[PDB]
């Protein structure tokens, strides 16, 4: 489906306020100041922001340096999964991550990822609100992984965070959930990000592409190309760089402060 009827605008940018500290190891430390080198989020950066609420459906092919801090000032679980490849045309394996309502699909397949994996159906007109459409691809070949997980039932409050380890064998994701509120649109503060999974996909990974719901009901007239509803959400994406950090752990064992020895001479003085 060639879903058109969406406008062209330059990307959104905003600033990164120290929102990104991934506990780098399992060591239960506490009440210490463990200095440690680690690729991280360079504090304070005019980083981009694909701003997708005409109808503003911005979802271009985004490349992969090394990990993405992925915030969702949103309301209703639209952003779902992503692809992760270098050509994406079934000529190579690609990573695929899908997040349905029930299970996750991390299919490493030679798959021709064509069009958008949109969740249109949304039978709220028939009092059901069940969305289903699979244009995530066309074919699935030589897929060496798939993980049906525990089956679950699926203001602005879903600021996600997803450091993705380019180093294969262990695609760990550092994350937090946050009940965000007011329309600060990117809050200031400081929060932790424990590592999560570990996947020996072993592939050359290169380009993710967000997978999302579209709202299709009576109030959505017209052919597929334009017959949908947008729904308000916004997301921020950041890349990482190799830095050296100083962390400050409380008595409760929680990371509570950090210092980037690479921002100012004052900082560096502290860091020594």
């Amino acid at each position: 489906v060639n879903l058109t009827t969406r406008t062209q605008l330059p990307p959104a940018y905003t600033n990164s306020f120290t929102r990104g500290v991934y506990y780098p190891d399992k060591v239960f430390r506490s009440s210490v100041l463990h200095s440690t080198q680690d690729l991280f989020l360079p504090f304070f950066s005019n980083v981009t922001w694909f701003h997708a609420i005409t109808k503003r459906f911005d979802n271009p092919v985004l490349p992969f340096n090394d990990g993405v801090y992925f915030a969702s000032t949103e309301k209703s679980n639209i952003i779902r999964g992503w692809i992760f490849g270098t050509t994406l045309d079934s000529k190579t394996q690609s990573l695929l991550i899908v997040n349905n309502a029930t299970n996750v699909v991390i299919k490493v397949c030679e798959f021709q990822f064509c069009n958008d994996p949109f969740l249109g159906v949304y039978h709220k007109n028939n009092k059901s609100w069940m969305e289903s459409e699979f244009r995530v691809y066309s074919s699935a070949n030589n897929c060496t992984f798939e993980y049906v997980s525990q089956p679950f039932l699926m203001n602005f409050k879903n600021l996600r965070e997803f450091v993705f380890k380019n180093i294969d064998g262990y695609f760990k994701i550092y994350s937090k959930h946050t009940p965000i509120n007011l329309v600060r649109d990117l809050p200031q503060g400081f929060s932790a990000l424990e590592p999560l999974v570990d996947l020996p996909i072993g592939i050359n990974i290169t380009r993710f592409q967000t997978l999302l719901a579209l709202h299709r009901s009576y109030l959505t007239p017209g052919d597929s190309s334009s017959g949908w509803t947008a729904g308000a959400a916004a997301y921020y994406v950041g890349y990482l760089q190799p830095r050296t950090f100083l962390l400050k752990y409380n008595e409760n064992g929680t990371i509570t402060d950090a210092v980037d020895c690479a921002l100012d001479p004052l900082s560096e003085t502290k860091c020594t």
Partner: protein, 298 residues
Amino acid sequence: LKSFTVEKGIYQTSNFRVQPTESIVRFPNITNLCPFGEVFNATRFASVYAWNRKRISNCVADYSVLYNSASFSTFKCYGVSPTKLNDLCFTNVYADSFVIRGDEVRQIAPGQTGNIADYNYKLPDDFTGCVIAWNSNNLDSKVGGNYNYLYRLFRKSNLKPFERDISTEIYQAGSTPCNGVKGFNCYFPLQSYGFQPTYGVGYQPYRVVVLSFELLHAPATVCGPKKSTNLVKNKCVNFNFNGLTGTGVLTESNKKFLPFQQFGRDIDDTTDAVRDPQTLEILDITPCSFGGVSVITP
């Protein structure tokens, strides 16, 4: 003092140190059996420029089957002595198998030179694994010469460790690329081996397998047949939690770990804890009686 007479005073001499009573073992549980038959008894092996890789996790390892099967000479190890492989649990196992000629076996070493090292297979310098090869003529060499075994000869630059290149395109040695006409001044980077069973030992097909390990830091995934032991407390003993050996006293904790945390490390980065990888309880790990002795005399 090296004398037979001592003056009034107090002189320090040696040190005292209780000794531990016993050792314990505390592992997660049990696995199954490693597929070494599948890796060492394949019908045919891959060619070097397309060497293969297999993952090993979640199985009980062994060595006596390798010693039980056909003579596997050239069994050399880096960062391990082969015998103690069975007495150590390792996570991250991978096995890469392929076939070459009998000569370029000398080239499989961390840090080397040659067509294979540069264009077909590179080992990391800090490679902490073990290489195993053997001649195979009753299997790979056929009277007409086996040509199914190929390799790469040409490339702009050398490979980085653990990389493979399956791309096939005419190399242009000189300038003015011929652009796919495959004329002279242009090379097909791949060639093939002739394996007539008449060349001699310097040209026999050798089957090679390399087992690569990764330092034990992340929770382990392969082990050996050592049994866990019951747990005892409040005695200077020899503990081994999941390959983490030590000797001292353990105590039940007051601490609070996040589900991804496991030990006590202190300012000097030394352990006082384990979460029991059977009961998942935090124990604080601490050395026992230390001291040096003084004697008073008139």
